[PDB]
Design a protein around this nucleic acid. Structure first.
Length: 349
RNA sequence: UUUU
């Protein structure tokens, strides 16, 4: 039924037509508090204590990432953890190597055997293989991986959210909207975070990521494989970008325009592109617009170019070969677009 | 297809 709009779910409708204050009165203070709590040090220490003996004579470092750490989490959020065993931080594996899978396999029995951890799932077939486990002393669910890129984009999001808090409020709202619309199986919280970032770049409220990664005498790249993962941490004052105070009216107006924008976006020809950060970035052109390391990387890993023959293209701003929405279907996109359209209408005054 |  491509000729009928998919009706916005009632659970979402009640939240939209409900006051914007109710959305945040509790959620923003909680999310900001959860960026740093002492439980995370316990988890870190316990994870090192656990795994060290299993990898003697190898450096071991734990890096926390994901929605808790960036400031859009809630009490039921997982904590994402990158375990770096043997200085793997700067190694990129689009799909895990057999050596990486072997390390993850060896880690599994440690969580099983420890009374401090409940093994929930062992997912070795994923693009980013993970161990899902509950840290029992704190009750916090942890996703443990061997891939540094999530930590890298977390540090970027943190800089963005701290410099321009409107971004953080918007991501908390749209995260909740996605859950109430039952879209999470297709569109992740991370995907819509990038969409918020791109929308605000178009409003001159956030920099293009590429502009933060100019390579010259004063700035060199931190490379994870071919990807530039660092960025200049300049004040927005120096970048020439205004910094807004989030108020309920300001937030509501930006959300209305956000949903209006993605309701009318031409997903057939354009991609959401926070790297470039400019309007109307063509799917047909993006691959020729990236740094020379991208072309070299694909030339030597030809099945690892960005997947552009997909209904919806949202490019990760650091892992430039990753369309984070590659799993969205034609009907999933129609659903999202229809929900955006109806949400924009309900936010009008 | 499963982290971000």
């Amino acid at each position: 039924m491509q000729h009928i709009t998919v009706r916005l779910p009632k659970k979402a409708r009640a939240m939209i037509v409900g006051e914007i204050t109710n959305v945040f009165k509790d959620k923003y203070p909680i999310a900001d508090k959860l960026k740093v709590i002492p439980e995370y040090d316990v988890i870190e220490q316990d994870l090192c204590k656990l795994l060290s003996p299993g990898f003697p004579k190898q450096p071991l470092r734990v890096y926390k990432f994901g929605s808790r750490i960036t400031g859009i989490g809630n009490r039921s959020s997982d904590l994402d953890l990158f375990v770096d065993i043997g200085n793997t931080f700067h190694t990129f594996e689009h799909r895990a190597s057999n050596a990486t899978v072997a390390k993850l396999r060896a880690m599994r029995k440690f969580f099983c055997d420890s009374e401090d951890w409940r093994l929930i799932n062992f997912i070795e077939q994923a693009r980013v293989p993970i161990i899902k486990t509950c840290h029992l002393p704190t009750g916090i669910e942890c996703d443990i991986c061997l891939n540094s890129m999530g930590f890298c984009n977390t540090n970027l999001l943190k800089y963005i959210f701290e410099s321009q808090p409107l971004t953080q409020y918007m991501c908390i709202y749209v995260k909740n909207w996605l859950e109430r619309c039952k879209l999470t199986e297709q569109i992740s919280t991370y995907s819509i975070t990038l969409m918020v970032i791109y929308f605000l770049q178009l409003q001159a409220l956030l920099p293009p990521i590429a502009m933060l990664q100019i390579e010259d005498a004063a700035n060199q790249a931190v490379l994870v494989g071919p990807w530039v993962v660092n960025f200049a941490q300049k004040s927005f004052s120096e970048l020439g970008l205004q910094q807004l105070k989030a108020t309920v009216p300001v937030i509501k107006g930006f959300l209305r325009n956000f949903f209006a924008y993605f309701a009318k976006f031409d997903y057939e020809h354009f991609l959401v592109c926070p790297y470039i950060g400019q309007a109307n970035v063509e799917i047909a052109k993006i691959e020729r617009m990236l740094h020379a390391r991208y072309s070299a990387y694909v030339s030597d890993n030809p099945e690892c170019s960005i997947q552009l023959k997909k209904p919806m293209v949202v490019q990760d701003p650091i892992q430039l070969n990753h369309n984070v929405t590659k799993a969205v279907t034609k009907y999933g996109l129609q659903t999202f677009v229809d929900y955006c359209q109806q949400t924009a209408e309900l936010l009008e005054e």
